[PDB]
Amino acid sequence: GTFNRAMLRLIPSLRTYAEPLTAAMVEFYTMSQERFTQDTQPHYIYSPREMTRWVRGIFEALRPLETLPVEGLIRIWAHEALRLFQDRLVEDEERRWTDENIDTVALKHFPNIDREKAMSRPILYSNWLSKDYIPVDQEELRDYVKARLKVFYEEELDVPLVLFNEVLDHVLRIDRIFRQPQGHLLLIGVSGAGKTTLSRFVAWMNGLSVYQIKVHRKYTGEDFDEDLRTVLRRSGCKNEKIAFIMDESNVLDSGFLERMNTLLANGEVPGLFEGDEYATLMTQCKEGAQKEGLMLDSHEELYKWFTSQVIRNLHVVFTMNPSSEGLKDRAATSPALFNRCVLNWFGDWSTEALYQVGKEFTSKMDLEKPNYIVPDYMPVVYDKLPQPPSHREAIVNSCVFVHQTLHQANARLAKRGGRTMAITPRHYLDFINHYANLFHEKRSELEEQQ
Amino acid sequence: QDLKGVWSELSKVWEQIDQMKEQPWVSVQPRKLRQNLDALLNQLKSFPARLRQYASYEFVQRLLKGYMKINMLVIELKSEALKDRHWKQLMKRLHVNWVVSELTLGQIWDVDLQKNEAIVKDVLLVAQGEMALEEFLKQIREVWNTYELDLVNYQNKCRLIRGWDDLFNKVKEHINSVSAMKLSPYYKVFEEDALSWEDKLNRIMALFDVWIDVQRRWVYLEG
Amino acid sequence: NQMSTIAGDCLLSAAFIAYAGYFDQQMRQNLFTTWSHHLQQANIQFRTDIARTEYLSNADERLRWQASSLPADDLCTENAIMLKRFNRYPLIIDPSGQATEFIMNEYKDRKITRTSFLDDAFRKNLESALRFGNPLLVQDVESYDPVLNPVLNREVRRTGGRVLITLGDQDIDLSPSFVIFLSTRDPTVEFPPDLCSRVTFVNFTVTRSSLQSQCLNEVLKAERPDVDEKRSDLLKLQGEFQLRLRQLEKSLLQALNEVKGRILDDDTIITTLENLKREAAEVTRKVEETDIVMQEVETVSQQYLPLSTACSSIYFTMESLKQIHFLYQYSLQFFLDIYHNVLYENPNLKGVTDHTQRLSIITKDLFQVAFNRVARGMLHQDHITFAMLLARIKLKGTVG
Amino acid sequence: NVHLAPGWLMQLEKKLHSLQPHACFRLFLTMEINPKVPVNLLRAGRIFVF
Ligand SMILES: Nc1ncnc2c1ncn2[C@@H]1O[C@H](COP(=O)(O)OP(=O)(O)O)[C@@H](O)[C@H]1O
């Protein structure tokens, strides 16, 4: 309540709303804490820490904005509520419950407001289309990110990416985490969903360089120390922002996690730089401090400056598969992964995502069929499928159904206790590429015969 | 009158295309070429609908479309992996008189890359394989012209050789690499140099195999 | 008409290639039926009798595969097809070990080398394969080394005139001829989701339905050659016979163009047109007589279904004998040798022409030979146990 | 007494698999029943319990 009365002082028009705002925040925090516990999922922990971040997020959004309507304040409140509570959720039922309860609490504690303007389905905030953190329309965001995707393909790396709404939101989430001191990010999702590509893309936007280590057999802890030394040197001494990206492949070794945990927690790891390494680190750190505009001679002060620079310049990005049993192990061997890293969950590729990916990839193929007649009842798996669907839409719907059939078959085999192999979006991309190649080859054969 | 107007409008585009085609192939920058081709297509798309109906406009538009399509082929050809032997092979397959100093974007663009794409892709795969083998050979040469014996003092009597395991591992690795390169489908070009380096590595291996025994026996007998 | 159905056919075939690789034969068939039912329900045209193994490969490749020691089974032909049209490097799960030999023979003209993840020299062999071009078959993927992630992901960067791939700390080049086949001799194993995503599983394990179908095919070939020929003609009815017809048309076109007015000078081309007419009439007759041959081969197969089920039960009993004692490790090749001895080289079958009587003799001799071959390598205390298991199998098989 | 050499038994199996004997070659492995015998060697042989 005192934190809010302090924060609402930025906008004098809203001062009587501090008590309703803090009541709504506390209420929603309590309901989320009660409903989601560590029993269902390992990472469903909620503490005053979440509410402090909530207050800090609302304060950061309100800081540049000169004046806001009450509906705008409620929109910011709801957006931060989502980004704090809905993001970590695993199940779509849980996400729906949180989304509904946000509107419920906002309308309960804030009467006499327009629900449509206060809260809408594509509730998104970004600072790419304007100087401040103002909400942006999802169509404009799609156009901007499409242009930046084209540029990112011409430059850096060429990683084709379909821009559906889920990826459009994940880009914003990763950007929000990246533009934050000690903004370590934890991405949990099935392989091939685009965790690494999205992080690289957002890092390219924000100017962050990307450092990924090449783990292998005989990749010793000494090699991990060398990689950590290089990234820490670049981040602290040379004031170069680094988006350290580590997958679960190189998290597997237990010796790596201790150093990673210490770096996440304190912004620095003790014993990494010793002897001649410490001497060289101080030699370069003094030059870096002079370049920035600080004159430090004492080794302890120089190391404190180095730690501050690593805090402000290094952003570790963790990615692993959605293994709840394996996620419990990471919590025991690394509490930083759950205390500092902002967990993000986008494992599932929704039916809409599959439909969009199929439609964009199956665009060169000549699937048009004028005499195709829509059936009276169609097994519509993508509920937002335009109707009456054309041959293209029917084919992409069938591809989505094929992927869902694989999911159901694997679920049934897991129920029976047999071995099950993961069905990733890499499988779906492979299936679409196989369809394209085989359709083209067979059409060429038949045209040659004709 | 309309034919005269469309010819006058297309004269600028044709002059720009000729300026492109007169660029020396050495100086041709394919990325800038792609950007300028996109700009030319954008300029052509601004032509009046009355002019757009003529067959010449469609022919030039399709020309620019295929011109953009073979821009990837220009990316691949501009690669430094292509050598004089591969350019001569391209001469033989395409039945052209391309002179090395006289290669130009106009020549590579008069030759229908949209039709000999299979031949060019084959020669470029060959070029990639040969470049991989040649760079392996260059790495071998650099390693074995930089390598030095790690001598350390032994009881102030002499400087005995150290790093026997590392030296033998490097020799075995390079011998096995050359033996496996003899199995490569692009081996016939570098056969002479491969034989020379196999001889060098075998001589090194025999020399140091005798040397380690001599040093060990001498150390024991001195003790 | 074929243009009207190519889209659905390619959809089903591509789905089968991409997915349905790790699953056993029964699950593959179930998934294919599910996809076909959906496509029919969505009014998407697909051929009602799509044979995957003959819509994705032709006779020359299948003959080459058979010459390269690929067993003549539907599952093995489908797996060989997936080993040919693969976008991601395949992972071969063959406890029997025939698929590794198949790959070795298939790529022997390309100087394919065999390596395992357990070997410490695996990194250098992989580096040489990537850098030069000869295909590589890596074994023991249960110990998969994560240096192979860039190779499996095809992360190639082209700086200057070099196509590099950062193998660990190095930056070795990539040759266009490189191709890697992971392998596994252990059917029961769990793979990380990333590895599952980066490879296409090619399951070669033999299950109950797989072995039953294989044994049914073998008995049909051995005892009913006419029924086996009619069954294969149904399969050749799509693709192969049409290709033969097109080859005949090409020959006629070449001969017709060759004559310099000799179309009437010799009056001998009419032999060629009548020969083509007779062959096309044969093909059309076989095409129209498809349902009848289908039901006929179905009934004849139903005649030997109890024998095939007995074969599968016997083999899996042999497999489960390993729990009784550690010495009782019997191979699918051992059981197939038993079956060869039962079908061919059978002294009791000589002089017998009744098909039902021959089937009865084969069914009896199958159990007799199975016992005579297994119990020799068993302690005397287990003879009664194995005889009781075989008696239960026979009691299940018999009708009445 | 081939059971005295467990690893050599696996090596012998590996040699046997990649080889083409003469039409009358017959390798006999007299042996004592023991868990030390490789599973692959057991699978690749015609066992005779005595
Ligand atoms: N929405 C998408 N559109 C296009 N390609 C996608 C999409 N999502 C994933 N991909 C593909 O995923 C691959 C990259 O996988 P990556 O993001 O590295 O996997 P992971 O998420 O397991 O780290 C590329 O081939 C890329 O094209």
PDB file of N, CA and C in Angstrom, chain B residues 103-172:
ATOM      1  N   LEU B 103      35.586 -12.091 -67.623  1.00  0.00           N
ATOM      2  CA  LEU B 103      34.331 -12.472 -66.992  1.00  0.00           C
ATOM      3  C   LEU B 103      33.544 -11.231 -66.604  1.00  0.00           C
ATOM      4  N   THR B 104      32.257 -11.237 -66.931  1.00  0.00           N
ATOM      5  CA  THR B 104      31.389 -10.136 -66.566  1.00  0.00           C
ATOM      6  C   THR B 104      29.999 -10.661 -66.250  1.00  0.00           C
ATOM      7  N   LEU B 105      29.288  -9.861 -65.458  1.00  0.00           N
ATOM      8  CA  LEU B 105      27.932 -10.205 -65.077  1.00  0.00           C
ATOM      9  C   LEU B 105      27.077 -10.352 -66.328  1.00  0.00           C
ATOM     10  N   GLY B 106      27.390  -9.577 -67.367  1.00  0.00           N
ATOM     11  CA  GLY B 106      26.702  -9.731 -68.637  1.00  0.00           C
ATOM     12  C   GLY B 106      26.887 -11.103 -69.252  1.00  0.00           C
ATOM     13  N   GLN B 107      28.101 -11.653 -69.176  1.00  0.00           N
ATOM     14  CA  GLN B 107      28.324 -13.003 -69.683  1.00  0.00           C
ATOM     15  C   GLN B 107      27.567 -14.033 -68.853  1.00  0.00           C
ATOM     16  N   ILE B 108      27.725 -13.977 -67.526  1.00  0.00           N
ATOM     17  CA  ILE B 108      27.093 -14.996 -66.688  1.00  0.00           C
ATOM     18  C   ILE B 108      25.574 -14.867 -66.727  1.00  0.00           C
ATOM     19  N   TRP B 109      25.068 -13.737 -67.216  1.00  0.00           N
ATOM     20  CA  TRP B 109      23.643 -13.447 -67.282  1.00  0.00           C
ATOM     21  C   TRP B 109      23.066 -13.668 -68.674  1.00  0.00           C
ATOM     22  N   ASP B 110      23.908 -13.597 -69.707  1.00  0.00           N
ATOM     23  CA  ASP B 110      23.529 -14.073 -71.031  1.00  0.00           C
ATOM     24  C   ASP B 110      23.434 -15.589 -71.052  1.00  0.00           C
ATOM     25  N   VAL B 111      24.370 -16.271 -70.392  1.00  0.00           N
ATOM     26  CA  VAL B 111      24.261 -17.719 -70.268  1.00  0.00           C
ATOM     27  C   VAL B 111      23.106 -18.053 -69.336  1.00  0.00           C
ATOM     28  N   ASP B 112      22.217 -18.931 -69.794  1.00  0.00           N
ATOM     29  CA  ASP B 112      20.953 -19.199 -69.113  1.00  0.00           C
ATOM     30  C   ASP B 112      21.218 -20.057 -67.883  1.00  0.00           C
ATOM     31  N   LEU B 113      21.492 -19.394 -66.757  1.00  0.00           N
ATOM     32  CA  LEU B 113      21.657 -20.113 -65.501  1.00  0.00           C
ATOM     33  C   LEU B 113      20.359 -20.760 -65.037  1.00  0.00           C
ATOM     34  N   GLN B 114      19.214 -20.309 -65.554  1.00  0.00           N
ATOM     35  CA  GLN B 114      17.938 -20.942 -65.252  1.00  0.00           C
ATOM     36  C   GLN B 114      17.766 -22.281 -65.956  1.00  0.00           C
ATOM     37  N   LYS B 115      18.668 -22.637 -66.874  1.00  0.00           N
ATOM     38  CA  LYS B 115      18.577 -23.891 -67.606  1.00  0.00           C
ATOM     39  C   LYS B 115      19.741 -24.841 -67.353  1.00  0.00           C
ATOM     40  N   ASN B 116      20.963 -24.336 -67.181  1.00  0.00           N
ATOM     41  CA  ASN B 116      22.105 -25.159 -66.805  1.00  0.00           C
ATOM     42  C   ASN B 116      22.331 -25.174 -65.297  1.00  0.00           C
ATOM     43  N   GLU B 117      21.268 -24.972 -64.514  1.00  0.00           N
ATOM     44  CA  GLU B 117      21.416 -24.904 -63.065  1.00  0.00           C
ATOM     45  C   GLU B 117      21.943 -26.218 -62.503  1.00  0.00           C
ATOM     46  N   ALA B 118      21.555 -27.348 -63.099  1.00  0.00           N
ATOM     47  CA  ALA B 118      22.057 -28.636 -62.632  1.00  0.00           C
ATOM     48  C   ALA B 118      23.562 -28.746 -62.844  1.00  0.00           C
ATOM     49  N   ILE B 119      24.038 -28.338 -64.023  1.00  0.00           N
ATOM     50  CA  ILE B 119      25.467 -28.403 -64.318  1.00  0.00           C
ATOM     51  C   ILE B 119      26.245 -27.494 -63.376  1.00  0.00           C
ATOM     52  N   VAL B 120      25.746 -26.274 -63.168  1.00  0.00           N
ATOM     53  CA  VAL B 120      26.461 -25.349 -62.296  1.00  0.00           C
ATOM     54  C   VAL B 120      26.447 -25.850 -60.857  1.00  0.00           C
ATOM     55  N   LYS B 121      25.329 -26.421 -60.407  1.00  0.00           N
ATOM     56  CA  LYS B 121      25.280 -26.958 -59.053  1.00  0.00           C
ATOM     57  C   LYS B 121      26.257 -28.115 -58.891  1.00  0.00           C
ATOM     58  N   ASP B 122      26.380 -28.962 -59.914  1.00  0.00           N
ATOM     59  CA  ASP B 122      27.352 -30.048 -59.858  1.00  0.00           C
ATOM     60  C   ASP B 122      28.773 -29.511 -59.743  1.00  0.00           C
ATOM     61  N   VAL B 123      29.121 -28.526 -60.576  1.00  0.00           N
ATOM     62  CA  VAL B 123      30.487 -28.013 -60.534  1.00  0.00           C
ATOM     63  C   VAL B 123      30.748 -27.288 -59.218  1.00  0.00           C
ATOM     64  N   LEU B 124      29.722 -26.678 -58.620  1.00  0.00           N
ATOM     65  CA  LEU B 124      29.924 -25.999 -57.345  1.00  0.00           C
ATOM     66  C   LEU B 124      30.033 -26.977 -56.182  1.00  0.00           C
ATOM     67  N   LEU B 125      29.303 -28.091 -56.226  1.00  0.00           N
ATOM     68  CA  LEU B 125      29.522 -29.149 -55.245  1.00  0.00           C
ATOM     69  C   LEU B 125      30.939 -29.697 -55.352  1.00  0.00           C
ATOM     70  N   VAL B 126      31.412 -29.897 -56.584  1.00  0.00           N
ATOM     71  CA  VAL B 126      32.792 -30.325 -56.790  1.00  0.00           C
ATOM     72  C   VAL B 126      33.755 -29.305 -56.197  1.00  0.00           C
ATOM     73  N   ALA B 127      33.497 -28.018 -56.440  1.00  0.00           N
ATOM     74  CA  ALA B 127      34.368 -26.971 -55.917  1.00  0.00           C
ATOM     75  C   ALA B 127      34.387 -26.974 -54.398  1.00  0.00           C
ATOM     76  N   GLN B 128      33.228 -27.172 -53.770  1.00  0.00           N
ATOM     77  CA  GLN B 128      33.174 -27.221 -52.313  1.00  0.00           C
ATOM     78  C   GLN B 128      33.984 -28.393 -51.771  1.00  0.00           C
ATOM     79  N   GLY B 129      33.846 -29.569 -52.383  1.00  0.00           N
ATOM     80  CA  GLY B 129      34.620 -30.715 -51.925  1.00  0.00           C
ATOM     81  C   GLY B 129      36.115 -30.508 -52.084  1.00  0.00           C
ATOM     82  N   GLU B 130      36.527 -29.996 -53.246  1.00  0.00           N
ATOM     83  CA  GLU B 130      37.943 -29.742 -53.479  1.00  0.00           C
ATOM     84  C   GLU B 130      38.479 -28.694 -52.516  1.00  0.00           C
ATOM     85  N   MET B 131      37.684 -27.662 -52.224  1.00  0.00           N
ATOM     86  CA  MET B 131      38.121 -26.644 -51.277  1.00  0.00           C
ATOM     87  C   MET B 131      38.270 -27.223 -49.879  1.00  0.00           C
ATOM     88  N   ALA B 132      37.359 -28.112 -49.478  1.00  0.00           N
ATOM     89  CA  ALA B 132      37.490 -28.754 -48.174  1.00  0.00           C
ATOM     90  C   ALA B 132      38.780 -29.559 -48.092  1.00  0.00           C
ATOM     91  N   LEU B 133      39.072 -30.341 -49.134  1.00  0.00           N
ATOM     92  CA  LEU B 133      40.305 -31.129 -49.127  1.00  0.00           C
ATOM     93  C   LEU B 133      41.544 -30.235 -49.135  1.00  0.00           C
ATOM     94  N   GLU B 134      41.535 -29.179 -49.952  1.00  0.00           N
ATOM     95  CA  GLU B 134      42.692 -28.296 -50.033  1.00  0.00           C
ATOM     96  C   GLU B 134      42.920 -27.562 -48.720  1.00  0.00           C
ATOM     97  N   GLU B 135      41.849 -27.154 -48.042  1.00  0.00           N
ATOM     98  CA  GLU B 135      42.012 -26.508 -46.750  1.00  0.00           C
ATOM     99  C   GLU B 135      42.458 -27.478 -45.668  1.00  0.00           C
ATOM    100  N   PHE B 136      42.049 -28.746 -45.744  1.00  0.00           N
ATOM    101  CA  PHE B 136      42.641 -29.752 -44.868  1.00  0.00           C
ATOM    102  C   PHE B 136      44.143 -29.846 -45.089  1.00  0.00           C
ATOM    103  N   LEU B 137      44.556 -29.872 -46.356  1.00  0.00           N
ATOM    104  CA  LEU B 137      45.974 -29.948 -46.685  1.00  0.00           C
ATOM    105  C   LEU B 137      46.729 -28.727 -46.173  1.00  0.00           C
ATOM    106  N   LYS B 138      46.132 -27.544 -46.313  1.00  0.00           N
ATOM    107  CA  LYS B 138      46.742 -26.322 -45.803  1.00  0.00           C
ATOM    108  C   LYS B 138      46.874 -26.362 -44.285  1.00  0.00           C
ATOM    109  N   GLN B 139      45.858 -26.882 -43.596  1.00  0.00           N
ATOM    110  CA  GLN B 139      45.943 -27.023 -42.146  1.00  0.00           C
ATOM    111  C   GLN B 139      47.070 -27.969 -41.753  1.00  0.00           C
ATOM    112  N   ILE B 140      47.216 -29.078 -42.482  1.00  0.00           N
ATOM    113  CA  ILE B 140      48.312 -30.008 -42.215  1.00  0.00           C
ATOM    114  C   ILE B 140      49.651 -29.304 -42.382  1.00  0.00           C
ATOM    115  N   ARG B 141      49.796 -28.554 -43.477  1.00  0.00           N
ATOM    116  CA  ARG B 141      51.051 -27.859 -43.745  1.00  0.00           C
ATOM    117  C   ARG B 141      51.371 -26.858 -42.644  1.00  0.00           C
ATOM    118  N   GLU B 142      50.376 -26.073 -42.228  1.00  0.00           N
ATOM    119  CA  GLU B 142      50.608 -25.088 -41.177  1.00  0.00           C
ATOM    120  C   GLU B 142      50.989 -25.759 -39.865  1.00  0.00           C
ATOM    121  N   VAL B 143      50.277 -26.825 -39.493  1.00  0.00           N
ATOM    122  CA  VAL B 143      50.552 -27.493 -38.223  1.00  0.00           C
ATOM    123  C   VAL B 143      51.962 -28.066 -38.217  1.00  0.00           C
ATOM    124  N   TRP B 144      52.354 -28.727 -39.304  1.00  0.00           N
ATOM    125  CA  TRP B 144      53.640 -29.407 -39.330  1.00  0.00           C
ATOM    126  C   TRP B 144      54.794 -28.510 -39.750  1.00  0.00           C
ATOM    127  N   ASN B 145      54.530 -27.257 -40.110  1.00  0.00           N
ATOM    128  CA  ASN B 145      55.601 -26.283 -40.240  1.00  0.00           C
ATOM    129  C   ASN B 145      55.709 -25.364 -39.032  1.00  0.00           C
ATOM    130  N   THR B 146      54.696 -25.340 -38.166  1.00  0.00           N
ATOM    131  CA  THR B 146      54.782 -24.617 -36.903  1.00  0.00           C
ATOM    132  C   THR B 146      55.273 -25.488 -35.753  1.00  0.00           C
ATOM    133  N   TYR B 147      54.975 -26.787 -35.780  1.00  0.00           N
ATOM    134  CA  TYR B 147      55.263 -27.672 -34.656  1.00  0.00           C
ATOM    135  C   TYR B 147      56.743 -27.665 -34.295  1.00  0.00           C
ATOM    136  N   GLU B 148      57.018 -27.615 -32.991  1.00  0.00           N
ATOM    137  CA  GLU B 148      58.370 -27.626 -32.449  1.00  0.00           C
ATOM    138  C   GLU B 148      58.476 -28.685 -31.363  1.00  0.00           C
ATOM    139  N   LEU B 149      59.647 -29.309 -31.267  1.00  0.00           N
ATOM    140  CA  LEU B 149      59.888 -30.294 -30.221  1.00  0.00           C
ATOM    141  C   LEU B 149      60.049 -29.601 -28.873  1.00  0.00           C
ATOM    142  N   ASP B 150      59.351 -30.113 -27.861  1.00  0.00           N
ATOM    143  CA  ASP B 150      59.380 -29.527 -26.522  1.00  0.00           C
ATOM    144  C   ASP B 150      60.550 -30.134 -25.758  1.00  0.00           C
ATOM    145  N   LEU B 151      61.684 -29.440 -25.782  1.00  0.00           N
ATOM    146  CA  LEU B 151      62.879 -29.886 -25.083  1.00  0.00           C
ATOM    147  C   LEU B 151      62.899 -29.337 -23.663  1.00  0.00           C
ATOM    148  N   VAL B 152      63.263 -30.194 -22.712  1.00  0.00           N
ATOM    149  CA  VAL B 152      63.410 -29.802 -21.317  1.00  0.00           C
ATOM    150  C   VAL B 152      64.728 -30.347 -20.791  1.00  0.00           C
ATOM    151  N   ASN B 153      65.341 -29.589 -19.884  1.00  0.00           N
ATOM    152  CA  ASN B 153      66.632 -29.972 -19.331  1.00  0.00           C
ATOM    153  C   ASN B 153      66.508 -31.232 -18.484  1.00  0.00           C
ATOM    154  N   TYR B 154      67.532 -32.082 -18.554  1.00  0.00           N
ATOM    155  CA  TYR B 154      67.566 -33.349 -17.826  1.00  0.00           C
ATOM    156  C   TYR B 154      68.866 -33.413 -17.032  1.00  0.00           C
ATOM    157  N   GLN B 155      68.787 -33.085 -15.739  1.00  0.00           N
ATOM    158  CA  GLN B 155      69.927 -33.175 -14.822  1.00  0.00           C
ATOM    159  C   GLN B 155      71.130 -32.385 -15.328  1.00  0.00           C
ATOM    160  N   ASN B 156      70.867 -31.303 -16.063  1.00  0.00           N
ATOM    161  CA  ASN B 156      71.907 -30.435 -16.616  1.00  0.00           C
ATOM    162  C   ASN B 156      72.887 -31.203 -17.501  1.00  0.00           C
ATOM    163  N   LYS B 157      72.456 -32.350 -18.024  1.00  0.00           N
ATOM    164  CA  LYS B 157      73.247 -33.131 -18.965  1.00  0.00           C
ATOM    165  C   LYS B 157      72.882 -32.843 -20.413  1.00  0.00           C
ATOM    166  N   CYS B 158      71.591 -32.734 -20.710  1.00  0.00           N
ATOM    167  CA  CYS B 158      71.112 -32.397 -22.044  1.00  0.00           C
ATOM    168  C   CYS B 158      69.666 -31.940 -21.922  1.00  0.00           C
ATOM    169  N   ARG B 159      69.051 -31.658 -23.067  1.00  0.00           N
ATOM    170  CA  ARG B 159      67.658 -31.224 -23.138  1.00  0.00           C
ATOM    171  C   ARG B 159      66.847 -32.337 -23.792  1.00  0.00           C
ATOM    172  N   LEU B 160      66.223 -33.171 -22.968  1.00  0.00           N
ATOM    173  CA  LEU B 160      65.454 -34.297 -23.472  1.00  0.00           C
ATOM    174  C   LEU B 160      64.128 -33.833 -24.060  1.00  0.00           C
ATOM    175  N   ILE B 161      63.579 -34.654 -24.949  1.00  0.00           N
ATOM    176  CA  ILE B 161      62.332 -34.330 -25.631  1.00  0.00           C
ATOM    177  C   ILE B 161      61.154 -34.670 -24.732  1.00  0.00           C
ATOM    178  N   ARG B 162      60.180 -33.770 -24.678  1.00  0.00           N
ATOM    179  CA  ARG B 162      58.955 -33.968 -23.920  1.00  0.00           C
ATOM    180  C   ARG B 162      57.768 -33.951 -24.875  1.00  0.00           C
ATOM    181  N   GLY B 163      56.586 -34.218 -24.331  1.00  0.00           N
ATOM    182  CA  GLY B 163      55.381 -34.254 -25.141  1.00  0.00           C
ATOM    183  C   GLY B 163      55.354 -35.390 -26.138  1.00  0.00           C
ATOM    184  N   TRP B 164      55.887 -36.554 -25.759  1.00  0.00           N
ATOM    185  CA  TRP B 164      55.875 -37.700 -26.659  1.00  0.00           C
ATOM    186  C   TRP B 164      54.451 -38.114 -27.001  1.00  0.00           C
ATOM    187  N   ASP B 165      53.567 -38.137 -26.001  1.00  0.00           N
ATOM    188  CA  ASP B 165      52.185 -38.526 -26.252  1.00  0.00           C
ATOM    189  C   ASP B 165      51.502 -37.559 -27.207  1.00  0.00           C
ATOM    190  N   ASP B 166      51.693 -36.254 -27.002  1.00  0.00           N
ATOM    191  CA  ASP B 166      51.064 -35.272 -27.880  1.00  0.00           C
ATOM    192  C   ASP B 166      51.599 -35.377 -29.302  1.00  0.00           C
ATOM    193  N   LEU B 167      52.917 -35.519 -29.452  1.00  0.00           N
ATOM    194  CA  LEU B 167      53.498 -35.619 -30.787  1.00  0.00           C
ATOM    195  C   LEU B 167      53.012 -36.872 -31.505  1.00  0.00           C
ATOM    196  N   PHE B 168      53.003 -38.011 -30.807  1.00  0.00           N
ATOM    197  CA  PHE B 168      52.550 -39.247 -31.433  1.00  0.00           C
ATOM    198  C   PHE B 168      51.066 -39.186 -31.761  1.00  0.00           C
ATOM    199  N   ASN B 169      50.266 -38.561 -30.895  1.00  0.00           N
ATOM    200  CA  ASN B 169      48.846 -38.412 -31.183  1.00  0.00           C
ATOM    201  C   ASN B 169      48.627 -37.559 -32.421  1.00  0.00           C
ATOM    202  N   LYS B 170      49.379 -36.464 -32.555  1.00  0.00           N
ATOM    203  CA  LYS B 170      49.258 -35.634 -33.749  1.00  0.00           C
ATOM    204  C   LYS B 170      49.661 -36.402 -35.001  1.00  0.00           C
ATOM    205  N   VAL B 171      50.755 -37.164 -34.927  1.00  0.00           N
ATOM    206  CA  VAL B 171      51.199 -37.925 -36.092  1.00  0.00           C
ATOM    207  C   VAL B 171      50.158 -38.968 -36.481  1.00  0.00           C
ATOM    208  N   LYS B 172      49.626 -39.700 -35.500  1.00  0.00           N
ATOM    209  CA  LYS B 172      48.607 -40.703 -35.796  1.00  0.00           C
ATOM    210  C   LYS B 172      47.355 -40.060 -36.373  1.00  0.00           C
TER     211      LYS B 172
END
